[PDB]
Design a protein around this ligand. Sequence first.
Ligand SMILES: Nc1ncnc2c1ncn2[C@@H]1O[C@H](C[C@@H](N)CC[C@H](N)C(=O)O)[C@@H](O)[C@H]1O
Ligand SMILES: Nc1ncnc2c1ncn2[C@@H]1O[C@H](C[C@@H](N)CC[C@H](N)C(=O)O)[C@@H](O)[C@H]1O
Ligand SMILES: [Zn+2]
Ligand SMILES: [Zn+2]
Lengths: 387, 387
Amino acid sequence: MEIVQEGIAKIIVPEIPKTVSSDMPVFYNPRMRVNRDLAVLGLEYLCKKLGRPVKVADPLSASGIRAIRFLLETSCVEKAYANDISSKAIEIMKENFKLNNIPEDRYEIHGMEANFFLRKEWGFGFDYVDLDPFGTPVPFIESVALSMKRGGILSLTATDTAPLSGTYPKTCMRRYMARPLRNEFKHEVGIRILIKKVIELAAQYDIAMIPIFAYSHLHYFKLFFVKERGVEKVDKLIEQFGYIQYCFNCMNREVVTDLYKFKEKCPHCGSKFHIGGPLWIGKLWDEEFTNFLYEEAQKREEIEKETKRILKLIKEESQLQTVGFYVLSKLAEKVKLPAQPPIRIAVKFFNGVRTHFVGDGFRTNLSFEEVMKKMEELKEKQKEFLE
Amino acid sequence: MEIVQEGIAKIIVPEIPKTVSSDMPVFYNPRMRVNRDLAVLGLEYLCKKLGRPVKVADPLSASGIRAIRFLLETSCVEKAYANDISSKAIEIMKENFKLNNIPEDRYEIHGMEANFFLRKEWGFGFDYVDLDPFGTPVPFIESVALSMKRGGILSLTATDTAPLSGTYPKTCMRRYMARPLRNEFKHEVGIRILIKKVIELAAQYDIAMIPIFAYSHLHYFKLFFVKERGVEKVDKLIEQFGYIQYCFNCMNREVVTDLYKFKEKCPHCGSKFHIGGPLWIGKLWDEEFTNFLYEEAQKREEIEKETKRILKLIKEESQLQTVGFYVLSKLAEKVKLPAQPPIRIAVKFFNGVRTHFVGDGFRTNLSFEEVMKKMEELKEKQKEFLE
Ligand SMILES: Nc1ncnc2c1ncn2[C@@H]1O[C@H](C[C@@H](N)CC[C@H](N)C(=O)O)[C@@H](O)[C@H]1O
Ligand SMILES: Nc1ncnc2c1ncn2[C@@H]1O[C@H](C[C@@H](N)CC[C@H](N)C(=O)O)[C@@H](O)[C@H]1O
Ligand SMILES: [Zn+2]
Ligand SMILES: [Zn+2]
C-alpha cells in the first residue's frame, strides 16, 4: 500500500494513520525507529565482540524490517531467521526481502507461533534475538532464553508500560508479581520490575539473563540482555532483587533488600512509606556496551539524529547510576523555589547527572535529606542575592 | 521385558531393580501406585461433576499406564491423548494400549516434546491433564494451564522435594523464587512453595489455577488444581501468598502477609526468627474434592489399600487446616515429657488432628504459646499422677 525507507532498508507496508502513538498497533510503526536503530547497534556490538558470522532471530517480524536492517546494516549476519504467525505478514515480509535484494541463503521465513519457532530443533543457538511484541514480552521470555546461545544478546521491547508504571497495579501484580509505584520515576520502577521478571523466568532453567541496557520512551521500554550460564551467575542476579520504599508526601525513597528492614512511616515527614517491588535494584547500563552504542551510532548516517542525542544522554546518565531519580519541578513545587535553573545547570548543585527518563530529572549520590538541604541552600542564596 | 498389573491395567515394562526409591527414574515405577490411584480418582470426580465425555492428556506418558488406567477405570473418557518424546517409550506405549484391548478411536499417541504436544492447535481444551515429570514440573506448567479447559483439573507430581524442602536452598530460590525452611514441617513448606509457583506462572496469562488437594510422600509431592478464568479469581489467589516465620530453637512459627510485619527475633526465646516464602498460605485441600476421593476410593477393589488409608487420614486432616504443624517427638524432646502418648491420643490434648506429613505430627488452632502450655500441663499431671 505504501513504500517507506528506514536506514538502508526499503519496505512495503500498509498505509498508517496521519498520527500514531509510540506503541501504535499497526503493521509498521515509524515511531519505533529509535528502537530499531538501537537493535541494529546492539547487533553490530556483537559482531565486533564475536568477530565471526552470527545467526539472528526475529520471532515477531511483521514487515521483516528488523531482520532486513540486521542483514543490510551490520557486518556479521550469516543468516537471519524471521517469523510471524500472520499469513499476510508473511506475504509482505517475502516481498520486502526481495525488494532489498537480499540473497535467499541469507534468510529463512517462517509462519509459526513464536514459541514454537524459537524452540524448533535448529541444531544451533541464536546469537542475537530481537523480541518486539505488542504489549508484554512475558509469554516469549523462556523460549527466547532457551533458544539463545551462551553469550548471545537479546534485544527486547515491552509496550505494556501502563501496568508496569503503576496505572494498573493489580494487572501489574498478576503479570509481574510486583507492586509498582506511580511516582515521578515510575517508568524506572516499571523497567526494574520488567527486568526482575525476565531474570526469574530464565533463572528457572539456570540461565542468567544479565541486563546491560535500558531505555524508556513514552509508551515503550527497550532492554538489552546477555545470556550466560552457571548457577552462581544466576545467584548473583537474584541477590540484586529488592524493593523501593517511597513516600508520596515528600518524595523520600529508600532501597530495601532485607525483609526485616521495612518501615511503615516515612522517616522524613512521617507519612505512609509505600513499598515497590520486588524488582531489579542493580545497574541499568553496562558501561562498555552503552559507550559502544553511542560511538558506533555516531559513525552511521542512517541512524536517526534522535537516537544519537538519546544515546549521548544515556552515556552521561550511565556514569552515575542510582535506584530512582529526582524531578526538579516537583522538588521546586515542594519548597517553592524562586526560579528553576535549566536542568543542565541544576544537576550541578546536586553533584548529579541528567536522566533520559524525564526532561528535568536528575540522579545523584546525595541522600534524600542532603538533596532537600541543597534545595534549601539554593532558594536561600537565590533570595539573599536577589538584593 | 516384564509384565505387570496395576489396577485393571496390564503393561509391558523393562525389568526394574530389586528395590527402588519412591522417585526412582525408571520407565515404570510401581511405588508410584498411590500417585496413579489418586489421579484415577481425581478423573472420576470430574466424570461425575461434568456428567459428559471428557478429553484427557498424558503429556509425559512413558509406559502409557496413566492414560490406560484413565480409559479402563473411569466412566467418561471420550479420548485420551498420550505423549512421550522417547521413541522406545512410544513403541512400548503402543503395545500397551493394544495389550489392554483399547479401541483405536479412544486414544492418540504422539512423540513430541511435551510443551509442543500440549500447545498443538487441538481445537479443544483438555478437561484433565496428568503431569508426571522426573523432578520439577515448572517447565510444563504454562503449557498445561493454557492447554486446559476452563473447569478442568490438573493432576500434578513433583519429585524435586529436596530443594523445595530446604536441603538445597539456593537451588530452590533459582527455580521457585522462594526461601524454604528445613524444619519439622519442611515438606509442607515445600508444597506451599510449589503451589505458589504454579499459581504465579498461570497468573501471567490471567489463568487461575486453584489448588484443591495436596499429598506428600517420601520423595514426591502430589497436587491437584482446577483451572478457572477471570482476573478477580487470579487476584484472590495472589492475595493468599505469604510468608512463614519460624524459629529453629523453640519451633515457634507465624504467618506474615504484611511486609511491614517481619520480626528479627523470635518472640518466645529471642533466637533468630527465620523467614520462609513467599508461598501459598491458603487451604491445601478442597473439602468436597477430598471427601469424594476417599468415598470413591472405598468402592474400588483395584485401588491400593494404602491409598485408602492415606485418604482417610487426609480427610481427617482437611477438617483442621493450618499453616505448618507440630511434631510430638520434637516438642517432647524440648520439654522432656515422661512418656509420649500415641499420636492418636496426643492430638486430643491439643484439640488437633493427625497429619499425613509425619507419623507423630499434628495440626491445631492453638497458638504456639498455648501448645507449649499444654506440653507443660501434660508432663505436670503425668508427674503428679505418677504417684
Ligand atoms: N504468538 C505469535 N507468534 C508469532 N507472531 C506473533 C504472535 N503474536 C503476534 N505475532 C506477530 O507479532 C508481530 C508483532 C509486531 N509488533 C512486530 C513488529 C516488528 N518487529 C517491527 O519492528 O516492525 C505482529 O506482526 C503479529 O503478527
Ligand atoms: N520434554 C519432554 N517431552 C516429552 N516427554 C518427556 C520430556 N521429558 C521427559 N519426557 C518423558 O517423560 C517421561 C516421564 C515419566 N516420569 C513418566 C511416568 C509415567 N507418567 C508413569 O506414571 O509411569 C519419560 O518417559 C520421558 O521419556
Ligand atoms: Zn515523606
Ligand atoms: Zn524461638
